[PDB]
Protein backbone atom coordinates (compact mmCIF):
# COMPACT_ATOMS: atom_id res chain seq x y z
CA UNK A 1 0.00 0.00 0.00
CA UNK A 2 3.09 2.62 -0.14
CA UNK A 3 2.40 5.34 -2.65
CA UNK A 4 3.22 5.14 -7.04
CA UNK A 5 6.85 6.50 -6.96
CA UNK A 6 7.62 5.66 -3.69
CA UNK A 7 11.33 5.69 -3.05
CA UNK A 8 13.51 2.46 -2.38
CA UNK A 9 16.93 3.20 -1.26
CA UNK A 10 20.09 1.75 1.31
CA UNK A 11 21.97 4.03 3.40
CA UNK A 12 25.47 4.53 4.76
CA UNK A 13 28.38 6.71 6.29
CA UNK A 14 31.79 7.25 5.42
CA UNK A 15 33.84 6.30 8.23
CA UNK A 16 31.38 3.16 9.35
CA UNK A 17 32.57 1.87 5.01
CA UNK A 18 35.36 3.64 3.77
CA UNK A 19 38.62 2.74 5.58
CA UNK A 20 41.37 4.11 4.15
CA UNK A 21 41.95 6.12 7.19
CA UNK A 22 45.75 7.30 6.04
CA UNK A 23 44.90 7.95 2.70
CA UNK A 24 45.08 10.53 0.07
CA UNK A 25 45.64 13.28 2.49
CA UNK A 26 42.96 12.19 5.05
CA UNK A 27 42.88 14.61 8.44
CA UNK A 28 42.48 12.57 11.44
CA UNK A 29 38.87 12.78 12.55
CA UNK A 30 37.54 12.89 16.40
CA UNK A 31 36.68 8.58 15.30
CA UNK A 32 40.34 8.62 14.42
CA UNK A 33 40.95 9.91 18.27
CA UNK A 34 38.07 7.87 20.23
CA UNK A 35 38.96 4.14 18.22
CA UNK A 36 42.56 4.79 19.30
CA UNK A 37 41.46 5.02 23.13
CA UNK A 38 41.46 1.64 24.81
CA UNK A 39 37.75 0.44 26.42
CA UNK A 40 35.89 2.94 24.05
CA UNK A 41 34.92 0.26 20.89
CA UNK A 42 33.61 -3.20 23.04
CA UNK A 43 35.88 -5.31 20.47
CA UNK A 44 38.58 -3.24 20.55
CA UNK A 45 37.77 -2.10 16.64
CA UNK A 46 38.20 0.84 14.61
CA UNK A 47 37.42 1.85 10.97
CA UNK A 48 41.17 1.94 9.91
CA UNK A 49 39.71 -0.98 7.02
CA UNK A 50 35.87 -1.72 7.62
CA UNK A 51 34.35 -2.64 4.49
CA UNK A 52 36.88 -0.90 2.45
CA UNK A 53 34.71 0.96 0.52
CA UNK A 54 37.37 3.97 -0.29
CA UNK A 55 38.96 0.49 -2.71
CA UNK A 56 35.94 -1.78 -3.54
CA UNK A 57 33.01 1.21 -4.07
CA UNK A 58 32.90 0.10 -7.84
CA UNK A 59 31.56 -3.56 -6.28
CA UNK A 60 29.27 -1.95 -3.91
CA UNK A 61 27.95 0.28 -5.80
CA UNK A 62 27.13 -2.66 -9.01
CA UNK A 63 25.41 -4.15 -5.77
CA UNK A 64 22.92 -1.25 -5.86
CA UNK A 65 22.39 -1.72 -8.76
CA UNK A 66 21.62 -4.89 -8.78
CA UNK A 67 19.14 -4.18 -6.07
CA UNK A 68 17.34 -2.16 -7.82
CA UNK A 69 17.34 1.12 -5.65
CA UNK A 70 16.55 4.42 -6.80
CA UNK A 71 18.51 6.10 -4.29
CA UNK A 72 21.97 6.07 -2.04
CA UNK A 73 22.02 7.63 0.48
CA UNK A 74 25.91 8.29 1.46
CA UNK A 75 28.27 10.52 3.68
CA UNK A 76 31.39 13.01 2.58
CA UNK A 77 33.97 12.58 4.74
CA UNK A 78 34.81 16.16 5.92
CA UNK A 79 38.40 14.76 6.73
CA UNK A 80 39.21 14.20 3.19
CA UNK A 81 37.70 17.54 2.07
CA UNK A 82 39.57 19.55 4.46
CA UNK A 83 41.75 17.43 6.70
CA UNK A 84 41.94 20.00 9.62
CA UNK A 85 38.37 21.70 9.01
CA UNK A 86 39.58 25.11 7.13
CA UNK A 87 41.10 26.08 4.54
CA UNK A 88 41.41 24.96 0.58
CA UNK A 89 39.94 21.75 -0.38
CA UNK A 90 42.34 18.37 -0.38
CA UNK A 91 41.85 17.47 -4.55
CA UNK A 92 42.30 13.47 -3.78
CA UNK A 93 39.26 14.20 -1.52
CA UNK A 94 37.08 15.78 -4.17
CA UNK A 95 37.94 13.45 -6.87
CA UNK A 96 36.49 10.60 -4.86
CA UNK A 97 33.21 12.05 -4.33
CA UNK A 98 33.05 13.29 -7.85
CA UNK A 99 34.13 9.74 -9.30
CA UNK A 100 31.25 7.94 -6.89
CA UNK A 101 28.34 10.60 -7.83
CA UNK A 102 29.34 9.65 -11.73
CA UNK A 103 28.73 6.59 -11.36
CA UNK A 104 26.18 6.22 -9.37
CA UNK A 105 24.72 8.55 -12.24
CA UNK A 106 25.30 6.39 -14.70
CA UNK A 107 23.75 3.21 -12.96
CA UNK A 108 20.46 5.39 -12.80
CA UNK A 109 20.39 5.61 -8.82
CA UNK A 110 19.93 9.28 -7.32
CA UNK A 111 22.44 10.47 -5.24
CA UNK A 112 21.56 11.15 -1.47
CA UNK A 113 24.60 13.06 0.33
CA UNK A 114 24.86 13.26 3.87
CA UNK A 115 27.49 16.39 4.96
CA UNK A 116 28.40 15.75 8.31
CA UNK A 117 27.77 12.05 10.10
CA UNK A 118 30.02 12.96 12.81
CA UNK A 119 33.53 12.29 11.59
CA UNK A 120 34.55 15.98 12.85
CA UNK A 121 38.09 16.60 11.77
CA UNK A 122 40.27 16.72 14.86
CA UNK A 123 41.46 19.99 14.54
CA UNK A 124 38.09 21.67 15.19
CA UNK A 125 37.42 19.74 18.27
CA UNK A 126 40.66 20.79 19.59
CA UNK A 127 39.72 24.35 19.29
CA UNK A 128 36.21 23.71 20.78
CA UNK A 129 34.49 21.13 18.28
CA UNK A 130 30.51 21.95 18.30
CA UNK A 131 31.09 23.95 21.63
CA UNK A 132 32.63 26.81 18.72
CA UNK A 133 30.21 28.73 16.92
CA UNK A 134 32.79 29.21 14.52
CA UNK A 135 32.19 25.55 13.64
CA UNK A 136 29.10 26.71 11.94
CA UNK A 137 30.85 28.53 9.89
CA UNK A 138 33.42 26.34 9.09
CA UNK A 139 30.32 23.77 8.30
CA UNK A 140 28.80 26.30 6.20
CA UNK A 141 32.37 26.49 4.20
CA UNK A 142 32.37 23.08 3.60
CA UNK A 143 28.94 22.96 2.17
CA UNK A 144 29.62 25.13 -0.32
CA UNK A 145 33.00 23.29 -1.46
CA UNK A 146 30.39 20.39 -1.44
CA UNK A 147 27.69 22.11 -3.34
CA UNK A 148 30.37 23.84 -6.17
CA UNK A 149 31.59 20.11 -6.80
CA UNK A 150 28.26 18.23 -6.86
CA UNK A 151 25.15 20.45 -6.64
CA UNK A 152 24.11 20.00 -10.37
CA UNK A 153 24.84 16.25 -9.65
CA UNK A 154 23.51 15.35 -6.03
CA UNK A 155 19.25 13.87 -5.86
CA UNK A 156 18.94 14.70 -2.11
CA UNK A 157 21.41 16.50 0.68
CA UNK A 158 21.06 15.78 4.57
CA UNK A 159 23.15 18.05 6.00
CA UNK A 160 23.83 16.87 9.53
CA UNK A 161 22.74 13.18 10.66
CA UNK A 162 21.22 12.94 14.14
CA UNK A 163 22.19 16.14 15.25
CA UNK A 164 20.51 14.60 18.80
CA UNK A 165 23.00 11.53 19.10
CA UNK A 166 25.75 14.29 18.26
CA UNK A 167 24.78 16.50 21.33
CA UNK A 168 23.17 14.03 24.09
CA UNK A 169 25.61 11.05 23.53
CA UNK A 170 28.71 12.79 22.08
CA UNK A 171 28.87 15.67 23.99
CA UNK A 172 25.99 15.11 27.07
CA UNK A 173 27.18 11.82 28.48
CA UNK A 174 30.13 11.38 26.30
CA UNK A 175 29.15 7.33 25.06
CA UNK A 176 30.67 8.80 21.79
CA UNK A 177 32.96 10.78 19.93
CA UNK A 178 34.76 13.30 21.38
CA UNK A 179 33.51 11.74 24.16
CA UNK A 180 32.44 14.98 26.66
CA UNK A 181 30.18 14.67 29.68
CA UNK A 182 28.82 18.44 29.74
CA UNK A 183 25.27 16.89 30.58
CA UNK A 184 23.41 20.48 29.82
CA UNK A 185 26.44 21.94 29.01
CA UNK A 186 25.60 20.70 25.69
CA UNK A 187 22.94 22.28 24.86
CA UNK A 188 25.12 24.90 22.81
CA UNK A 189 26.51 22.19 20.52
CA UNK A 190 23.08 21.62 19.09
CA UNK A 191 22.04 25.19 18.27
CA UNK A 192 25.51 25.39 16.74
CA UNK A 193 24.72 22.10 14.69
CA UNK A 194 21.07 23.64 14.20
CA UNK A 195 22.85 27.10 12.60
CA UNK A 196 25.17 24.71 10.57
CA UNK A 197 22.46 22.94 9.29
CA UNK A 198 20.81 26.13 8.11
CA UNK A 199 24.17 27.88 6.68
CA UNK A 200 24.84 24.88 4.77
CA UNK A 201 21.03 24.64 3.14
CA UNK A 202 22.07 28.07 1.73
CA UNK A 203 25.13 26.96 0.70
CA UNK A 204 23.72 24.15 -0.95
CA UNK A 205 20.69 26.11 -2.50
CA UNK A 206 23.31 29.01 -3.86
CA UNK A 207 25.46 26.67 -5.12
CA UNK A 208 22.41 25.05 -7.49
CA UNK A 209 21.54 21.98 -5.20
CA UNK A 210 18.55 20.06 -5.70
CA UNK A 211 16.31 18.81 -2.85
CA UNK A 212 18.00 19.68 0.67
CA UNK A 213 16.16 17.89 3.74
CA UNK A 214 17.49 16.77 7.07
CA UNK A 215 18.20 13.47 8.78
CA UNK A 216 17.38 13.42 12.50
CA UNK A 217 16.79 10.07 14.76
CA UNK A 218 13.15 10.83 15.73
CA UNK A 219 11.20 8.11 18.12
CA UNK A 220 7.86 8.11 20.36
CA UNK A 221 8.60 8.63 24.07
CA UNK A 222 6.92 6.17 26.56
CA UNK A 223 7.18 6.75 30.26
CA UNK A 224 8.25 3.66 31.64
CA UNK A 225 5.19 3.99 34.49
CA UNK A 226 2.59 6.32 35.98
CA UNK A 227 5.09 8.74 38.17
CA UNK A 228 5.09 12.30 37.54
CA UNK A 229 8.84 12.05 38.06
CA UNK A 230 8.70 9.10 34.77
CA UNK A 231 6.09 10.88 32.96
CA UNK A 232 7.64 14.53 33.53
CA UNK A 233 10.85 12.28 32.88
CA UNK A 234 9.75 11.26 29.04
CA UNK A 235 8.05 14.41 28.46
CA UNK A 236 11.56 16.66 29.24
CA UNK A 237 13.19 13.26 26.77
CA UNK A 238 10.98 13.94 24.12
CA UNK A 239 11.44 17.77 24.53
CA UNK A 240 15.20 17.15 23.96
CA UNK A 241 15.70 14.49 21.39
CA UNK A 242 12.45 15.47 19.06
CA UNK A 243 11.28 18.62 19.69
CA UNK A 244 14.85 20.23 20.78
CA UNK A 245 15.81 19.19 16.76
CA UNK A 246 12.05 19.70 15.00
CA UNK A 247 10.69 22.70 16.39
CA UNK A 248 13.61 24.70 15.40
CA UNK A 249 13.63 23.35 11.72
CA UNK A 250 9.98 23.30 10.97
CA UNK A 251 8.63 26.10 13.06
CA UNK A 252 11.40 28.62 13.70
CA UNK A 253 10.96 28.51 17.60
CA UNK A 254 12.41 26.45 20.75
CA UNK A 255 10.73 24.37 22.68
CA UNK A 256 9.72 26.07 25.86
CA UNK A 257 12.60 27.06 27.73
CA UNK A 258 15.46 26.56 25.77
CA UNK A 259 15.80 29.58 23.79
CA UNK A 260 16.64 31.19 27.11
CA UNK A 261 19.59 28.82 27.59
CA UNK A 262 21.02 29.16 24.06
CA UNK A 263 23.87 31.09 23.04
CA UNK A 264 24.12 33.93 20.84
CA UNK A 265 21.62 36.18 18.61
CA UNK A 266 19.18 33.22 19.41
CA UNK A 267 16.15 34.66 17.23
CA UNK A 268 18.41 35.52 14.57
CA UNK A 269 19.85 32.42 14.69
CA UNK A 270 16.34 30.47 14.67
CA UNK A 271 16.22 32.85 10.81
CA UNK A 272 18.95 30.93 9.64
CA UNK A 273 17.97 27.45 11.30
CA UNK A 274 14.07 27.33 9.87
CA UNK A 275 14.88 27.53 6.12
CA UNK A 276 12.56 25.78 3.79
CA UNK A 277 13.45 22.44 3.16
CA UNK A 278 12.09 20.22 0.06
CA UNK A 279 11.90 17.16 2.33
CA UNK A 280 11.90 16.20 5.92
CA UNK A 281 14.54 13.06 6.40
CA UNK A 282 13.89 11.01 9.81
CA UNK A 283 15.79 8.02 11.10
CA UNK A 284 13.92 5.28 12.93
CA UNK A 285 14.81 2.40 14.94
CA UNK A 286 12.24 1.97 17.73
CA UNK A 287 10.41 3.89 20.48
CA UNK A 288 12.09 5.11 23.66
CA UNK A 289 11.58 4.13 27.36
CA UNK A 290 12.64 6.98 30.04
CA UNK A 291 11.81 7.11 33.64
CA UNK A 292 12.92 8.97 36.91
CA UNK A 293 16.98 13.82 35.23
CA UNK A 294 16.23 10.44 33.65
CA UNK A 295 17.07 7.42 32.45
CA UNK A 296 16.28 5.89 29.44
CA UNK A 297 15.89 2.02 28.85
CA UNK A 298 14.08 -0.60 26.84
CA UNK A 299 10.39 -0.48 26.43
CA UNK A 300 9.08 -4.11 27.60
CA UNK A 301 7.33 -7.06 25.90
CA UNK A 302 8.49 -6.30 22.67
CA UNK A 303 10.91 -8.60 21.21
CA UNK A 304 14.24 -7.57 20.69
CA UNK A 305 17.08 -7.01 17.89
CA UNK A 306 20.69 -8.22 18.27
CA UNK A 307 21.55 -4.85 19.98
CA UNK A 308 18.82 -5.40 22.45
CA UNK A 309 16.63 -2.96 20.67
CA UNK A 310 12.87 -3.05 20.60
CA UNK A 311 10.57 -4.12 17.38
CA UNK A 312 8.28 -2.37 17.48
CA UNK A 313 6.99 -1.26 14.19
CA UNK A 314 3.38 0.28 14.92
CA UNK A 315 5.93 2.76 16.34
CA UNK A 316 7.09 4.71 13.25
CA UNK A 317 3.07 4.96 12.57
CA UNK A 318 2.92 6.62 15.78
CA UNK A 319 5.64 9.20 15.08
CA UNK A 320 4.55 9.88 11.50
CA UNK A 321 1.19 10.51 12.16
CA UNK A 322 2.33 12.31 15.87
CA UNK A 323 5.02 14.37 13.28
CA UNK A 324 2.75 15.68 11.07
CA UNK A 325 0.15 16.25 14.07
CA UNK A 326 3.28 18.92 15.45
CA UNK A 327 4.23 20.27 12.34
CA UNK A 328 0.89 20.47 9.72
CA UNK A 329 3.05 22.23 7.28
CA UNK A 330 6.21 19.47 7.56
CA UNK A 331 7.35 18.39 3.36
CA UNK A 332 7.09 15.15 2.08
CA UNK A 333 8.97 13.06 4.72
CA UNK A 334 11.74 10.13 3.61
CA UNK A 335 12.54 7.69 6.34
CA UNK A 336 16.29 8.09 5.78
CA UNK A 337 17.16 5.31 7.67
CA UNK A 338 15.60 2.27 9.31
CA UNK A 339 16.75 -1.10 9.72
CA UNK A 340 17.96 -3.90 12.44
CA UNK A 341 21.21 -5.53 13.68
CA UNK A 342 21.24 -9.19 13.39
CA UNK A 343 24.10 -11.01 13.75
CA UNK A 344 24.06 -13.91 10.94
CA UNK A 345 26.72 -14.72 8.63
CA UNK A 346 27.16 -17.09 5.68
CA UNK A 347 26.21 -21.05 6.32
CA UNK A 348 28.57 -23.38 4.87
CA UNK A 349 26.96 -23.13 1.79
CA UNK A 350 27.69 -19.60 1.53
CA UNK A 351 24.42 -18.73 1.89
CA UNK A 352 23.26 -15.88 4.95
CA UNK A 353 19.50 -16.49 5.64
CA UNK A 354 19.02 -13.51 7.81
CA UNK A 355 14.67 -13.89 7.67
CA UNK A 356 14.81 -12.05 10.83
CA UNK A 357 15.91 -8.72 8.82
CA UNK A 358 13.24 -9.36 6.62
CA UNK A 359 10.42 -9.81 9.29
CA UNK A 360 11.78 -6.54 10.66
CA UNK A 361 12.00 -4.27 7.22
CA UNK A 362 8.84 -5.92 5.92
CA UNK A 363 6.72 -4.84 9.14
CA UNK A 364 8.17 -1.14 9.16
CA UNK A 365 7.41 -0.60 5.04
CA UNK A 366 3.92 -2.11 6.40
CA UNK A 367 4.41 0.70 8.93
CA UNK A 368 4.69 3.11 6.40
CA UNK A 369 1.97 2.34 4.38
CA UNK A 370 -0.44 2.20 7.58
CA UNK A 371 0.89 5.70 7.89
CA UNK A 372 0.03 6.81 4.52
CA UNK A 373 -3.45 5.38 4.83
CA UNK A 374 -4.26 8.01 7.14
CA UNK A 375 -3.20 10.80 5.41
CA UNK A 376 0.83 11.11 6.22
CA UNK A 377 2.73 12.20 3.20
CA UNK A 378 5.83 9.92 2.95
CA UNK A 379 7.69 9.58 -0.39
CA UNK A 380 10.59 6.94 0.28
CA UNK A 381 12.61 4.84 2.98
CA UNK A 382 16.19 3.46 3.09
CA UNK A 383 18.12 0.84 4.68
CA UNK A 384 20.40 1.00 7.14
CA UNK A 385 22.29 -0.80 5.59
CA UNK A 386 23.49 -1.66 2.44
CA UNK A 387 26.94 -3.19 4.17
CA UNK A 388 27.71 -4.59 7.72
CA UNK A 389 29.88 -1.99 8.93
CA UNK A 390 31.94 -0.49 11.97
CA UNK A 391 29.05 0.36 14.10
CA UNK A 392 30.74 3.37 16.54
CA UNK A 393 30.99 2.16 19.69
CA UNK A 394 30.01 -1.28 19.28
CA UNK A 395 32.38 -1.82 16.77
CA UNK A 396 31.80 -4.97 14.44
CA UNK A 397 29.62 -7.12 16.51
CA UNK A 398 26.38 -5.38 15.36
CA UNK A 399 25.56 -6.40 11.59
CA UNK A 400 23.10 -4.01 10.10
CA UNK A 401 23.84 -5.10 6.45
CA UNK A 402 21.84 -6.49 2.90
CA UNK A 403 25.04 -7.43 2.47
CA UNK A 404 27.25 -9.24 4.77
CA UNK A 405 30.99 -8.01 4.80
CA UNK A 406 33.59 -10.58 6.06
CA UNK A 407 36.49 -7.70 7.73
CA UNK A 408 39.22 -10.39 7.16
CA UNK A 409 38.59 -11.00 3.48
CA UNK A 410 36.63 -8.14 2.68
CA UNK A 411 34.20 -10.54 0.49
CA UNK A 412 30.63 -9.55 0.65
CA UNK A 413 27.78 -11.88 0.25
CA UNK A 414 24.01 -10.45 -0.33
CA UNK A 415 21.97 -11.87 2.26
CA UNK A 416 18.40 -13.11 2.24
CA UNK A 417 17.15 -9.75 2.96
CA UNK A 418 18.93 -8.24 -0.48
CA UNK A 419 17.06 -10.72 -2.78
CA UNK A 420 14.05 -9.74 -0.30
CA UNK A 421 14.45 -6.35 -0.49
CA UNK A 422 15.19 -6.57 -4.92
CA UNK A 423 12.10 -8.24 -5.13
CA UNK A 424 9.46 -5.78 -3.16
CA UNK A 425 11.14 -2.72 -5.09
CA UNK A 426 10.54 -4.61 -8.41
CA UNK A 427 7.26 -5.57 -7.52
CA UNK A 428 6.30 -1.67 -6.37
CA UNK A 429 7.29 -0.42 -10.10
Same mark, same amino acid.
Given at each position: ?????? $??????????????????????? =????????????????????????????????????????????????????????????????????????? %???????? /???????????????????????????????????????????????? +???????????????????????????????????????? $???????????????????????????? &????????????????????? /?? $?????????????? !? +???????????????????????????????????????????????? /? &???????????????? =?? +???????????????????????????????????????????????????????????? *? %???????? !??????????????????? *??????????
Amino acid at each position: GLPPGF $LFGASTASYQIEGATTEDGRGPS =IWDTFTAEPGRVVDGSSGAVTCDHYHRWPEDVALLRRLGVDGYRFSIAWPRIQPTGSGPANQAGLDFYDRLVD %ALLEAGIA /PMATLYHWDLPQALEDGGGWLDRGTASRFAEYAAIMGDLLGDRVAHWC +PVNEPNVVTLNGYGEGSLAPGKALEFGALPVAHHLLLGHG $LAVQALRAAGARQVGTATNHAPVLPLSG &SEADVTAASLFDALWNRLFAD /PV $LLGRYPDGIADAMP !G +PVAEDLLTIAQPLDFYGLNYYNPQGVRAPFDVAAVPGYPTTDFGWPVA /P &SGLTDLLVEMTERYPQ =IP +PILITENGCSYGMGPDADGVVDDQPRIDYLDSHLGAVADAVARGVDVRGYYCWSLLDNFE *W %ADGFTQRF !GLVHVDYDTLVRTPKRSFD *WYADVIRAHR
